[PDB]
Structure formats: structure tokens, C-alpha cells
Amino acid sequence: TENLYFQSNAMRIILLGAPGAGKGTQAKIIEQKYNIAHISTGDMIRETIKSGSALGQELKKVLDAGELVSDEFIIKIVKDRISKNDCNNGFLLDGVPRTIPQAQELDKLGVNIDYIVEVDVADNLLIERITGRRIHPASGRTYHTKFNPPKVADKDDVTGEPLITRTDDNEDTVKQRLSVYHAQTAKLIDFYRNFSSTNTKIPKYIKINGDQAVEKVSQDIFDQLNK
Amino acid sequence: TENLYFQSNAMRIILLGAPGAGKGTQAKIIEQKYNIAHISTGDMIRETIKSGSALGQELKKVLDAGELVSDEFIIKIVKDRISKNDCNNGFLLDGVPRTIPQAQELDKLGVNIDYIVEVDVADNLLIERITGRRIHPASGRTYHTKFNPPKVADKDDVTGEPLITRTDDNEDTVKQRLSVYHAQTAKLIDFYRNFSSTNTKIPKYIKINGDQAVEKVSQDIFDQLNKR
Ligand SMILES: [Ca+2]
């Protein structure tokens, strides 16, 4: 009569969204409401390197040789990450699959995905969100030329020392990385749109208007998952 | 009983450790093993603001005013955070309570803390771990004078531009923060050891040798958490 924990159906999500779209905020919100693991690649890699595990030893080897992480290998890391107890209820993938071979390896590794949730925000707004970023390098204090401006243009509020724009946040780099995002993503969705497998299920594709209040973006997402 | 299981008691942990002690790494590890939420003050504050919540709105105004979040307000923020579904199985508090009034406020709320876990590392090692940090500002590429050196001193590997030390990574500041942490931590331990509260329980204090391999530090922690 104390056996009253019911394991509900797994909620397993691939989250997609451009640099600047604010998908990281939605991921935390989903994680906290549905009680599933937010798995982001950046975190997963660093934690793996720190672990001292064989997986981590092999990864640290690769990265010290200059070679980039293979698709088969990053998905092997994912499979391990999702074997953990905090993934009992499902998970949210944030950063993988980034390519067709990654998605194929997930299928072959037997990882089922229920939803693909894409937070869509207009290119121009995305552009402005990245390119406006400033930083005071010595302290790391952040500003944004539109969303969080300094008292005096291009100067740190505390010290008066000049701000800089990070190298990657220049307009041309943003637009180029933006383009490869949209192309890499469009191929991923059409892959999943024409998904045909005997090892895993066909995920439901969901496209969210991310140009609304945060609480509204969240509800639109919630409404879709429940449908 | 068809796919029904025993409702276990939630585990609630206060995690303590000085800057550079690696507490952040162990928190993630504990989170993943025990399926409890890792709540760090920094993230909690950023999230609450970005939420559009009424509480989040007030918090953003306090901070936009350049004011400090009071002891009472930070616990109100903790109260909202731990009401979420990912906290039903328990949580690990990281960065709160830092003061006695936070611990008292936490206690008035009815939060029962099962364990205090202190990841202890010698001061000489802590200081070294912070002071040897260097960054290339334009890229954000980071290095460590000992643990991950650049190929040429004070120079970024990729571009060759100079590296800097962040201002708070200076030895004078590092020592000062170390001294504060140890003092506040002593007070905290003392508070919970002499715990004579009517509303919440007496936590089990666990001190951990954090100067070991990550996997060994975790297993020591598990060992203590798993004791009957
Ligand atoms: Ca959980």
C-alpha cells in the first residue's frame, strides 16, 4: 500500500533551434515540468572528459590529437548518458543529432524519439541577438547593445574599460553559421519526415513560434506534447 | 501492483565546497545517479528571471536596480524552484544557504535536509586551481598555467593574441574568497551540528577528500550517502 509510484510513459525529445532562438531556456522549462534529463552536447562532452571513464579517456585522446569527434562516437556517448538513472522518465536531446549519420546511429543504437520540437525564430531577430553582444574581457561582464546596454557605449559600467565583440559574434560569421544551421536542420527534418525504420519509432515533428513571451512559447510547446 | 513501485523518501542535500574544489562536477554525478535536481544559485536566478513568472519579474527588477538579493528573497526563489516536478525525488542545493539567516529561513519553510556534503581540498591546491587560469577574451578559449598550458606563455594557441588573467582570479582576491568561504562554512556546519529546531531534522554532515580522482571522489560520496 506504499507501492504508489507509477512510471509514466517515456517523454523523449530532440530539441532544435538556431543560435539566439532561446531553446536553452525552453529546455530547462521542459525538464523541470516533465521531470526528464536535459542532455546538451557541450555539457555531456565536458562531463565525459572529467569522468576518467574509458569513454572519457578515448575522447580526451581524440581532442588532444586535434581530430574532431566522430558521429558514431558522440552517439556512443549519448547512449551511455541516457542509461543513467536521471533518464528514467525520458530525456531531451539538445545538440544531437546534428547530422544524418548521427540520427542513423541513434536508430541503430535503438534510441527511440517521441518528438522533434523546433523553436523557430526569424533570421533577423536571431542576427540581432548575437551581433549585439558585448563583453568586458577582464571581468567577463556581459552587455547587449539593444537588450542590456552599458551606461556609456562600448565601455564597462564598473571600470570604464572598453568592451569588445567576441570574434564569432561578428555579423558575417553569424549569418554564415546561421545558414549552415538552417541547411543542416532542413536535412534532419526531412530525414525524420521520411523516417522509415524497423529498430525505432517515427518521431512527431513540432514547429514552435519562438517569437512570443517565454511563458507563451512554453505553453505552445506544452499544448503540442499533450496532443 | 502493476508497474507500481515503492514511494521512496526524497533525498535532500546541501553541497559545500570552495572555489576550485570541483563540487560542480560531483553535483552532476550525484544528480545523474540519484535522480534528484541539482539546484545551483546562479542558474536558478538566471532561469527565474527568463521565466516571466511574477516572482521572476520582481527578481529581475531587484537585479536591474543593481541591488542585492536578500537572504529572504533567495530562499523565496528556492521555495519556487523546489516546487517543480523535477524536485519531487529530492534535490541538491549548491550555493545556498550561505548564511545563517538563509539556513533559518530554509528551516522555517519546512525543508528537511538529509545530508551536508563538503568536498574538502587543501587551500594550496584550491588557490593554484584558480590563479593559473588564463583566457583569450576574443574567442573565450581558456587555458591553465599548470593543468592545460598554452603552447607559448601568455599567448593563444590558435591566433597568437595575448591571454589575460580574469580580475577576480588574482591571488589576493582568491585568498580573500577562500577565507570567507571557510568562515561561512564553519558557521554553517556549527549551525547544523547544534541544530535544535522543532520544524526540521538534524542533517548528517559528511566531509569528503576531494583531492582524489573524480570517480574515487564520487564513490566516497556514494559510500557515505548510502549508509543506513
Ligand atoms: Ca529527474
* d(CA A86, nearest CA chain B) in Å: 4
To what resolution in angstroms was this structure determined?
A: 2.1
Q: What is the DSSP letter of A162?
A: B
Cβ(B67)–Cβ(B100) below 8 Å: no
DSSP H or E segment with residue B48: helix B41-49
For β-strands B115-120 and B133-136, DSSP reports them as unpaired
Sign of CA dihedral B207, B210, B212, B215: positive
| Phi then psi dihedrals of residue A199, to 5 deg | -100, -35
CA of B36 to the centre of ligand 1 (A): 5
Cα–Cα distance between B126 and B130 in angstroms, integer?
A: 7
- Which chain A residues are Cβ-neighbours of B168 within 8 angstroms? 139
User: Does the N-terminal peptide bond of residue A19 adopt cis geometry, omega within 30 degrees of 0?
Assistant: no
Residue ranges of alpha helices (H) inside chain A are 23-34, 41-51, 54-65, 71-81, 100-108, 123-131, 171-193, 214-226
Q: Searching chain A, which residue's CA lies closest to the CA of residue B4?
A: A6
End-to-end alpha carbon distance in chain B: 27
Cβ(A134)–Cβ(A145) below 8 Å: yes
Cα–Cα distance between A92 and B162 in angstroms, integer?
A: 39
Residue type, B18: A
For β-strands A90-94 and A115-120, DSSP reports them as unpaired
Sheet of A11-17: strand order equals A37-40, A90-94, A11-17, A115-120, A204-209
B113: helix, coil or strand? coil
Cα–Cα distance between B199 and B50 in angstroms, integer?
A: 33
Sign of CA dihedral B204, B208, B214, B216: negative
End-to-end alpha carbon distance in chain A: 33
Cα–Cα distance between B36 and B87 in angstroms, integer?
A: 6
DSSP H or E segment with residue B90: strand B90-94
- The response to whether B92 counts as a known ligand-binding position is no
- The response to whether B198 counts as a known ligand-binding position is no
**Cell output for A188:** 534532419
B207: helix, coil or strand? strand
CB contact under 8 A, A5 and B6: yes
* d(CA A194, nearest CA chain B) in Å: 34
Domain map of chain B by residue range? 1-228
Cβ(A18)–Cβ(A126) below 8 Å: yes
- DSSP for B145-197, written as a single string: TTTB--SBTTB-TTT-PBPB--GGGSHHHHHHHHHHHHHHHHHHHHHHHT---
Q: What is the DSSP letter of B111?
A: P
Furthest C-alpha separation in chain B = 65
Give residue A73's Cα distance to chain centre: 18
CB contact under 8 A, A166 and B140: yes
Cβ(A11)–Cβ(A87) below 8 Å: no
* Residues of A recognised as catalytic: 23, 98, 133, 166, 177
Task: Provide the CATH number for the domain formed by A1-227 in this structure.
Answer: 3.40.50.300
CA of A30 to the centre of ligand 1 (A): 12
* Residues of B recognised as catalytic: 23, 98, 133, 166, 177
Residue type, A115: Y
Among candidates A130, A138, A125, which has minimal Cα distance to A166?
Answer: A130
Sequence-separated (6 or more) residues with CB below 8 Å from residue A208: A26, A117, A118, A119, A120, A217, A220, A221, A224
Task: Provide the CATH number for the domain formed by B1-228 in this structure.
Answer: 3.40.50.300
Q: Report the residue from B25, B138, B167 with minimal CB separation from A167.
A: B138
**Cell output for A92:** 531531451
Interrupted after residues, chain A (C–N over 2.5 Å): none
CA angle, B48 then B52 then B54, to 5° = 85
CB contact under 8 A, A6 and B1: no
Cα–Cα distance between A59 and A14 in angstroms, integer?
A: 23
Cα–Cα distance between B183 and B195 in angstroms, integer?
A: 18
Q: Which of B32, B48, B151, B215 to mutate to test the interface with A (most CBs of A within 10 A)?
A: B32
Cα–Cα distance between B95 and A50 in angstroms, integer?
A: 21
**Cell output for A191:** 530525414
List residues of A whose CB lies inside 8 A of any B CB: 2-7, 25, 28-29, 31-35, 37, 43, 47, 50-53, 84-86, 88, 135, 137-140, 164, 166-168, 213-215
